[PDB]
Amino acid sequence: KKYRKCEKAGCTATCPVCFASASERCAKNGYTSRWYHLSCGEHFCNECFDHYYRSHKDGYDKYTTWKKIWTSNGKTEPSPKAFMADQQLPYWVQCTKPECRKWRQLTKEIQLTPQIAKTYRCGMKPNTAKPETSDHCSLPEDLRVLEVSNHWWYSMLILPPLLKDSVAAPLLSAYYPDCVGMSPSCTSTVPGMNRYFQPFYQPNECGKALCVRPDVMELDELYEFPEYSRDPTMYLALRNLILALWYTNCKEALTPQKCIPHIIVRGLVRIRCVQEVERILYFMTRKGLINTGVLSVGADQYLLPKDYHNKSVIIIGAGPAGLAAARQLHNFGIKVTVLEAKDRIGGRVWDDKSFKGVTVGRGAQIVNGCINNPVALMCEQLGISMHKFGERCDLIQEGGRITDPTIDKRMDFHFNALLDVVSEWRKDKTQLQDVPLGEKIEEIYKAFIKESGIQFSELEGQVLQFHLSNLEYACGSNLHQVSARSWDHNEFFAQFAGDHTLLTPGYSVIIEKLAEGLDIQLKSPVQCIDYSGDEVQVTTTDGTGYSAQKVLVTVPLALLQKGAIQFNPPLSEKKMKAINSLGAGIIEKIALQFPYRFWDSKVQGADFFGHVPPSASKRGLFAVFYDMDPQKKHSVLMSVIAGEAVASVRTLDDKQVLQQCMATLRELFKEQEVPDPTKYFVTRWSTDPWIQMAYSFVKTGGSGEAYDIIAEDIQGTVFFAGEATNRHFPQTVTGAYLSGVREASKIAAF
Ligand SMILES: Cc1cc2nc3c(=O)[nH]c(=O)nc-3n(C[C@H](O)[C@H](O)[C@H](O)COP(=O)(O)OP(=O)(O)OC[C@H]3O[C@@H](n4cnc5c(N)ncnc54)[C@H](O)[C@@H]3O)c2cc1C
Ligand SMILES: [K+]
Ligand SMILES: [Zn+2]
Ligand SMILES: [Zn+2]
Ligand SMILES: [Zn+2]
Numbered sequence: 001k002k003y004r005k006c007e008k009a010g011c012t013a014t015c016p017v018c019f020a021s022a023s024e025r026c027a028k029n030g031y032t033s034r035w036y037h038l039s040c041g042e043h044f045c046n047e048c049f050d051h052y053y054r055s056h057k058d059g060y061d062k063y064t065t066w067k068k069i070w071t072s073n074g075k076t077e078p079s080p081k082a083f084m085a086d087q088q089l090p091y092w093v094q095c096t097k098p099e100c101r102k103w104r105q106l107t108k109e110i111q112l113t114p115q116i117a118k119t120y121r122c123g124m125k126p127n128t129a130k131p132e133t134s135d136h137c138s139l140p141e142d143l144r145v146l147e148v149s150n151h152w153w154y155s156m157l158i159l160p161p162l163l164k165d166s167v168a169a170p171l172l173s174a175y176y177p178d179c180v181g182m183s184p185s186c187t188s189t190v191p192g193m194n195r196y197f198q199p200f201y202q203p204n205e206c207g208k209a210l211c212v213r214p215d216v217m218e219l220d221e222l223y224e225f226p227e228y229s230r231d232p233t234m235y236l237a238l239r240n241l242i243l244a245l246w247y248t249n250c251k252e253a254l255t256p257q258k259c260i261p262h263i264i265v266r267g268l269v270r271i272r273c274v275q276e277v278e279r280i281l282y283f284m285t286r287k288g289l290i291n292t293g294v295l296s297v298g299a300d301q302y303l304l305p306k307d308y309h310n311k312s313v314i315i316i317g318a319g320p321a322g323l324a325a326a327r328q329l330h331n332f333g334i335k336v337t338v339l340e341a342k343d344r345i346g347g348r349v350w351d352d353k354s355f356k357g358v359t360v361g362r363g364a365q366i367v368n369g370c371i372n373n374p375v376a377l378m379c380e381q382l383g384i385s386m387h388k389f390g391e392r393c394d395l396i397q398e399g400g401r402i403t404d405p406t407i408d409k410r411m412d413f414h415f416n417a418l419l420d421v422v423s424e425w426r427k428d429k430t431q432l433q434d435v436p437l438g439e440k441i442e443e444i445y446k447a448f449i450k451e452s453g454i455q456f457s458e459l460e461g462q463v464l465q466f467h468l469s470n471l472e473y474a475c476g477s478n479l480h481q482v483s484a485r486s487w488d489h490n491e492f493f494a495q496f497a498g499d500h501t502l503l504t505p506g507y508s509v510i511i512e513k514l515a516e517g518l519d520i521q522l523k524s525p526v527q528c529i530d531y532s533g534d535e536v537q538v539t540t541t542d543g544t545g546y547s548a549q550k551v552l553v554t555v556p557l558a559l560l561q562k563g564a565i566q567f568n569p570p571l572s573e574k575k576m577k578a579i580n581s582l583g584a585g586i587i588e589k590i591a592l593q594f595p596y597r598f599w600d601s602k603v604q605g606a607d608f609f610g611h612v613p614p615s616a617s618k619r620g621l622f623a624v625f626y627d628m629d630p631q632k633k634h635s636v637l638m639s640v641i642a643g644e645a646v647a648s649v650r651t652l653d654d655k656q657v658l659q660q661c662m663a664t665l666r667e668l669f670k671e672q673e674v675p676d677p678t679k680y681f682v683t684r685w686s687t688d689p690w691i692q693m694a695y696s697f698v699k700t701g702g703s704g705e706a707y708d709i710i711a712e713d714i715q716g717t718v719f720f721a722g723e724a725t726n727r728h729f730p731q732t733v734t735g736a737y738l739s740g741v742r743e744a745s746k747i748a749a750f
Contacts, residue, residue, distance in 0.1 A: 002031030041144030074184025181237020207494030288741035302333030319347025324740025351508035357634035369496025438479030472643035476585020489704025557724035578709035581702035620645035
């Protein structure tokens with residue numbers, strides 16, 4: 001007949017009141033025949049089914065329009081409840097006066113906007129003006145506000161919230177808005193964003209590194225937010241909003257105050273959204289998914305809430321991983337000091353700046369696959385432009401002849417065919433049955449020649465050696481030390497999509513910015529790490545002590561292998577096994593300046609040219625030459641020494657290497673004259689005491705798991721980062737960077 005209590009058992013509202021006033025005969029406080037429940041604080045009367053029935057007035061027309069729009073654009077059931085929550089419920093804003101921040105209800109006729117939300121204060125009516133007395137900020141908040149903070153409140157919310165006008169929507173066209181936390185009432189009848197930022201997978205998309213499914217929660221997120229196990233849509237909307245905001249301005253720290261005006265949804269529920277967005281924000285900051293890169297955070301205010309646990313970290317080694325970890329922890333507000341052995345930062349990033357017109361890396365200078373790459377993000381932050389490698393790369397023979405591209409492509413096809421047979425071969429072989437990749441390739445080759453009856457020319461044979469020498473460059477070893485089973489172990493995980501680029505200005509630009517304003521001690525080689533006390537005791541070569549609650553080790557694989565730091569307690573037999581299972585690959589580089597760009601008429605502006613080895617024994621000797629000025633004005637070539645070639649250049653001094661390179665170029669350019677170079681460097685990484693390598697690879701008998709094992713923290717106090725520590729992205733500045741962010745994440749939690 002008529003009731004004064006809600007329809008739902010155990011509902012906490014003693015006196016339901018109708019939030020709509022659609023009906024001529026709306027039961028304001030009194031008895032409807034049925035009180036429909038939206039949430040604990042939100043109810044409407046059976047008369048305000050002015051909307052539902054065909055016979056009833058300025059309801060049915062509005063409702064039916066919404067209903068058609070709802071049905072086609074989204075996949076949620078249309079109902080009067082859904083209508084009320086999408087179309088009718090009042091909005092709630094917080095006061096923007098910083099000292100106040102109180103939640104207030106708006107009168108039904110108001111549509112919330114980011115303009116309103118940025119500027120609202122306790123008092124003001126349908127017009128923006130600050131009131132006069134600032135006394136409205138003293139009034140207590142409507143009692144329903146406090147309830148929304150309890151977890152039982154979300155239990156009693158009959159429909160999940162759907163966000164309006166999410167900055168994330170342009171990026172999410174392929175999805176049903178409601179599947180992704182946004183309102184099917186899409187009125188939006190993205191440019192400017194960096195082409196390299198593609199945060200979201202398009203539906204049913206295969207592995208592309210660092211993409212998030214916008215419609216599914218990852219297990220990491222579930223552990224932290226167990227309440228979204230059944231219905232993740234509220235969580236997903238907020239994370240997606242966060243990602244979209246961060247990538248639309250990655251130059252500034254993303255804060256809750258920045259996020260809130262972009263959260264538009266009617267009802268008391270907006271209060272749970274604004275509370276959750278802050279919790280999600282801190283989670284994603286700690287994980288390094290947001291508020292990261294070369295982001296400098298100012299004096300007083302840091303990226304995570306003040307904790308008072310007095311936690312401190314010593315970080316060993318100031319390369320990319322050390323610096324990534326150091327920067328993150330610092331930004332968090334954790335005390336960090338960095339001990340570095342060398343008289344400079346950067347480790348395997350080292351950029352020569354003395355060549356007029358260019359920066360040439362002694363170490364890293366390329367970015368393989370920019371899409372979602374943090375290196376791309378940091379470039380955007382620093383406003384620097386990378387150069388994308390063109391496809392053209394002619395293979396010049398000794399004598400001057402240019403190898404027809406059809407040979408090139410064919411021998412590459414054959415080389416790959418060989419590698420495919422290896423991946424079939426390995427299918428069932430255990431670790432203990434592994435075989436050098438070099439051995440296996442030859443075997444398969446020798447068989448392939450024997451079965452087919454194919455005869456290759458001398459030149460084809462030589463080009464096949466060129467392609468083999470690239471694999472060796474990639475590994476940093478002659479293939480005879482590389483595992484057939486797990487050489488490309490990491491290619492099972494999603495890899496970095498998009499452009500391969502020359503980081504023209506240098507990785508040093510990113511490195512120096514990461515370091516800026518941190519406590520870095522140079523000329524401080526660590527000799528001993530003692531973690532048996534309440535504090536970690538870190539002792540330097542010349543005897544200086546440093547102490548901290550936690551320590552992070554980022555020293556190169558070559559140096560864990562040699563055990564140059566003494567750990568007490570020792571590292572576990574398991575860990576040593578892992579460490580010794582990986583190889584410390586090596587390449588060297590040479591740079592040459594010339595008085596003019598002698599190669600221009602022959603090379604015609606391509607980023608690089610290749611050098612066909614005259615035999616198997618000369619395989620990695622200046623295999624490739626690089627034009628270090630994509631603007632084609634300055635005169636600097638760069639070349640690499642890989643594989644067996646490294647070993648042969650070991651008895652030669654810098655001048656003798658230079659003479660060998662010159663002789664090599666003059667063969668490649670026989671038909672013409674090549675000038676003497678005027679400035680050069682030859683790189684000696686393998687003998688650089690505190691580095692002794694270029695990048696890790698997996699040796700015969702080894703497993704991609706060794707990276708995971710090296711990364712495992714010890715008693716939650718000794719942590720490991722570094723290139724040889726990142727199973728997904730093994731060799732790169734990128735993987736190094738990400739490993740340092742990974743360990744900071746671990747540390748910041750406890
Ligand atoms: C010639 C060359 C070319 C390369 N090409 C590329 C490329 O094009 N693109 C790419 O992404 N990567 C490239 N790499 C690999 C990349 O440089 C590294 O993988 C990356 O720098 C990872 O380094 P890291 O973070 O482990 O720290 P690192 O750079 O390896 O070094 C960490 C620091 O540890 C310090 N240290 C060691 N022992 C101690 C100790 N006991 N106490 C204190 N400090 C210590 C070292 O001095 C060093 O400063 C190249 C490397 C080389 C050498
Ligand atoms: K009516
Ligand atoms: Zn009513
Ligand atoms: Zn109720
Ligand atoms: Zn106020």
